[PDB]
Design an enzyme around this catalytic site. Structure first.
Site, PDB file in Angstrom:
ATOM      1  CD  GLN A  19      -1.719   0.048   3.493  1.00 46.80           C
ATOM      2  OE1 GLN A  19      -2.337  -1.011   3.784  1.00 46.80           O
ATOM      3  NE2 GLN A  19      -1.957   1.190   4.084  1.00 46.80           N
ATOM      4  CB  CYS A  25      -5.690  -0.658   4.882  1.00 49.42           C
ATOM      5  SG  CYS A  25      -6.795   0.583   5.698  1.00 49.42           S
ATOM      6  CG  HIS A 162      -4.886  -2.085   8.966  1.00 52.23           C
ATOM      7  ND1 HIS A 162      -4.578  -1.536   7.748  1.00 52.23           N
ATOM      8  CD2 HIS A 162      -4.120  -3.195   9.081  1.00 52.23           C
ATOM      9  CE1 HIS A 162      -3.670  -2.282   7.140  1.00 52.23           C
ATOM     10  NE2 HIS A 162      -3.361  -3.291   7.937  1.00 52.23           N
ATOM     11  CG  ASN A 182      -0.700  -5.945   7.162  1.00 53.98           C
ATOM     12  OD1 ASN A 182       0.088  -5.502   7.985  1.00 53.98           O
ATOM     13  ND2 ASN A 182      -1.717  -5.245   6.715  1.00 53.98           N
TER      14      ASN A 182
END
Ligand SMILES: C[C@@H](/C=C/C(=O)C=O)NC(=O)[C@@H](Cc1ccccc1)NC(=O)OCc1ccccc1
Length: 215
Positions: A19, A25, A162, A182
């Site tokens: 990102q 996110c 997030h 992630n």
């Protein structure tokens, strides 16, 4: 439910992405869920475009933030269900600035017809995931810049901030855990993944879980 599921073992999860300095996110959470869901519907695993959402989804706030749920609906409602290939619409927001949306030059690499929101209960999320695939979740990620590996057993659980992708869990381990993809590169955590204890709402993981539905 089964004792352990890991959708990476089924060839259903694409590579860890980055990102950068954009607060995108949400875009990575939602597109990750669509990549997986599309594979599971019987198509080749295709990398799809976060930049489409960051640039074009005006019901979300670009690099300032957004909701996976609004991203799902904006896809269906405003973009005719179409999700662009990452190839045809590469990420260009690593600097924290998203360029203007372009409505041509792209190629469709998945479509979806809607989304479901899952219950706020880890046992029931796991049941759904076991069968239907990876799930977009929101988390309190406050703790997560100190994370280097292993199963985390104490996670600051105060405010959702997030968006990430739940890809498996293992209930047979000494400490049950979730496996989470992630979007901070492979340099972070377990090769871009984190594992957090399952059963105690670590990081508020049960609170905002959901998935796209493909045709
Ligand atoms: C800043 C960004 C990702 C940030 C990071 O990389 C921080 O570690 N967070 C978000 O975009 C999301 C994370 C989230 C997703 C779902 C439920 C609750 C929270 N945060 C977020 O604050 O969304 C705000 C918003 C709401 C409606 C319309 C536009 C914007």
């Amino acid at each position: 439910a089964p004792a352990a599921v890991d959708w990476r073992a089924r060839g259903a999860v694409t590579a860890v992405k980055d990102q950068g300095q954009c607060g995108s996110c949400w875009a990575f959470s939602a597109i990750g869920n669509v990549e997986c869901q599309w594979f599971l519907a019987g198509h080749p695993l295709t990398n799809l475009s976060e930049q489409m959402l960051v640039s074009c989804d005006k019901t979300d706030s670009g690099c300032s933030g957004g909701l996976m749920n609004n991203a799902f609906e904006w896809i269906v409602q405003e973009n005719n269900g179409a999700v662009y290939t990452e190839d045809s619409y590469p990420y260009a927001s690593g600097e924290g600035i998203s360029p203007p949306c372009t409505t041509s030059g792209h190629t469709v690499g998945a479509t979806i017809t809607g989304h479901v929101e899952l219950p706020q209960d880890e046992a029931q999320i796991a049941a759904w995931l076991a069968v239907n695939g990876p799930v977009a979740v929101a988390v309190d990620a406050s703790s997560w810049m100190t994370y280097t590996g292993g199963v985390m057993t104490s996670c600051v659980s105060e405010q959702l901030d997030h968006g990430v992708l739940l890809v498996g869990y293992n209930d047979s381990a000494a400490v049950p855990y979730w496996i989470i993809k992630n979007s901070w590169t492979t340099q972070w955590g377990e090769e871009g993944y984190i594992r957090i204890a399952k059963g105690s709402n670590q990081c508020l993981v049960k609170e905002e879980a959901s998935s796209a539905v493909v045709g």
